């Protein structure tokens, strides 16, 4: 009859679709462009601002803003433009008619959840909605009731252990390393080889280079010695104008910064050693079952060899006699959406929704008690 909308705000991609189907039918970058140059021609259809695939198409003349930085929504009018575009232009469905399910990272400020509810009820008039933790949804997607989720998109990285369907909130970790701040580093190392990508439009090109050519070394010192000692490792890529650029050790050297955040000047350990510290914060009965399932989720885990590097150094840190297993389905970029698509369709979930009546009675406050 009526089937929930499932929308994942993320950073970078918005991905959205109807509950109970196989893959998101709208996916596009969450990016708002405003034109910065003087417009010369008259009678043009020239437009206030552009969203998503429009802004990618015209990006040479636009300034591009991301309205979400480290899973926190920083600008609200931009975000409303992105949601408006999602429902009317991408899905072409009136939000009065469909419950909505919205996704978020853990330990981010409560004002984010409050204002994200207030906008959905008051401007869209969505009849009911819910806000869900990204990591939880990856287990629904991967068919497990137990595991430690390692999740990284653009923006926030976080670990959440889950055991038999119970969360373990004191062990949750959050890390700001992933995905954007890899690219902002890749621009600086490419400057060392004599290319300068400064503008916000050039950043999208560096992001595409990162998606195509980077990979994680099994041993970081062996491959730096090798690529110092050869050109065998070295690959060249064609910029949008037809120039060609050649990239050597920089291509493995960039995603290594996930495992040694001191490269960009962070304090914390890398993803393997927050994963291990997260399992260490759990009680000793469960640990054998957390080591047996590590579910990797979100796009920044897509680099080739990131699973095998994870398995190798966690096996170095772990006690010798337990199997470490890393689970990394090729789907994983969409896991959070697929998990939400399953969850929003369960019959047992239909009592969970915040309904408009409860909001009208109790105000934006309700979200914190009812959700998570």
């Amino acid at each position: 009859e009526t089937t929930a909308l499932v929308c994942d705000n993320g950073s970078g991609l918005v991905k959205a679709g109807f509950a109970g189907d196989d893959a998101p039918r709208a996916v596009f970058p969450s990016i708002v462009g405003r034109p910065r140059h003087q417009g010369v021609m008259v009678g043009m259809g020239q437009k206030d601002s552009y969203v998503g695939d429009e802004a990618q198409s015209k990006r040479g003349i636009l300034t591009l803003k991301y309205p979400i930085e480290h899973g926190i929504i920083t600008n609200w009018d931009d975000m409303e433009k992105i949601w408006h575009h999602t429902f009317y232009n991408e899905l072409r469905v009136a939000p009065e008619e469909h419950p909505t399910l919205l996704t978020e990272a853990p330990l981010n400020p409560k004002a984010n959840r409050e204002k994200m509810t207030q906008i959905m009820f008051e401007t869209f008039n969505v009849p009911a909605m819910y806000v869900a933790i990204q990591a939880v949804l990856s287990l629904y997607a991967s068919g497990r009731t137990t595991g430690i989720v390692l999740d990284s998109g653009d923006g926030v990285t976080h670990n959440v252990p889950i055991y038999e369907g119970y969360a373990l909130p004191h062990a949750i970790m959050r890390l700001d390393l992933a995905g954007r701040d890899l690219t902002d580093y890749l621009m600086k190392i490419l400057t060392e080889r004599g290319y300068s990508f400064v503008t916000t439009a050039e950043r999208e090109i560096v992001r595409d280079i990162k998606e195509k050519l980077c990979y994680v070394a099994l041993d970081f010192e062996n491959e730096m010695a090798t690529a110092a000692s050869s050109s065998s490792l070295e690959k060249s890529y064609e910029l949008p104008d037809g120039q060609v650029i050649t990239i050597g050790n920089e291509r493995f050297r960039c995603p290594e910064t996930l495992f040694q955040p001191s490269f960009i000047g962070m304090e914390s350990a890398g993803i393997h050693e927050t994963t291990y510290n997260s399992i260490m914060k759990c009680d000793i009965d469960i640990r054998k079952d957390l080591y047996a399932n590590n579910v990797m989720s979100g796009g920044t885990t897509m680099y080739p060899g990131i699973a095998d590097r994870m398995q190798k150094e966690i096996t170095a840190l772990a006690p010798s006699t337990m199997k470490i297993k890393i689970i990394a389905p090729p789907e994983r970029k969409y896991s959070v959406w697929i998990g939400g698509s399953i969850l929003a369709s369960l019959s047992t979930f239909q009592q969970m929704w915040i309904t408009k009546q409860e909001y009208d009675e109790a105000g934006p406050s309700i979200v914190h008690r009812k959700c998570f």
Partner: peptide
């Protein structure tokens, strides 16, 4: 964010 960070 609000303090310990730019967002």
């Amino acid at each position: 964010w609000x303090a310990x960070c730019p967002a």
